[PDB]
């Protein structure tokens, strides 16, 4: 049983640590505040059975914000192709990716 005493008595014992989108000290945002805000505002009140299949896009964007699976897979792809082209001698790294260009600011 989930005796919801916190909603009954109106006290906030531990809802504050529950999500990243909650209120943080000195307004420090989490790295996936916008993604989790979109996922929670999608999935609020519609129940979990509708929320697993009607908020799939928001939750997959939020999960890939969390773990960065697709991003690191894409960086593996680009770095692997780059190293293959350097090994074949068909590509050269540019001056700004060799560290010789007096950075912007």
């Amino acid at each position: 049983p989930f005796f919801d005493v916190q909603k009954k008595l109106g006290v906030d014992l531990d809802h504050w640590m529950t999500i990243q989108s909650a209120e943080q000290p000195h307004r420090i945002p989490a790295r996936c505040h916008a993604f989790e805000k979109e996922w929670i505002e999608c999935a609020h009140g519609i129940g979990s059975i509708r929320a697993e299949k009607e908020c799939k896009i928001e939750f997959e964007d939020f999960r890939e914000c969390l773990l960065r699976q697709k991003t690191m897979k894409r960086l593996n792809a680009i770095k692997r192709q780059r190293d293959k082209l350097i090994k074949e001698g068909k590509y050269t790294p540019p001056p700004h990716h060799s560290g010789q260009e007096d950075l912007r600011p």
Partner: protein, 70 residues
């Protein structure tokens, strides 16, 4: 008498004087005649790396003032 102990205390005091004096000299030597930049917080490191990028010699301790802008 009691002043015989002062040579040993003086040698121990010189050995305690060496590390701080030497690290002050080394900090003034490695940083353009100035103190070492204290970066405990992320904003201080961002300003320090911005100094390193605008100095043009990849040393943060080369201070560019009004002679650099037009």
């Amino acid at each position: 008498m009691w002043f015989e102990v002062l040579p040993g205390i003086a040698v121990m005091g010189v050995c305690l004087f060496i590390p701080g004096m030497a690290t002050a000299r080394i900090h003034r030597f490695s940083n353009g005649g100035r103190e070492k930049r204290v970066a405990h917080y992320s904003y201080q490191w961002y300003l320090m790396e911005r100094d390193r990028r605008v100095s043009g010699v990849n040393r943060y301790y080369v201070s560019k003032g009004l002679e650099n802008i037009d």
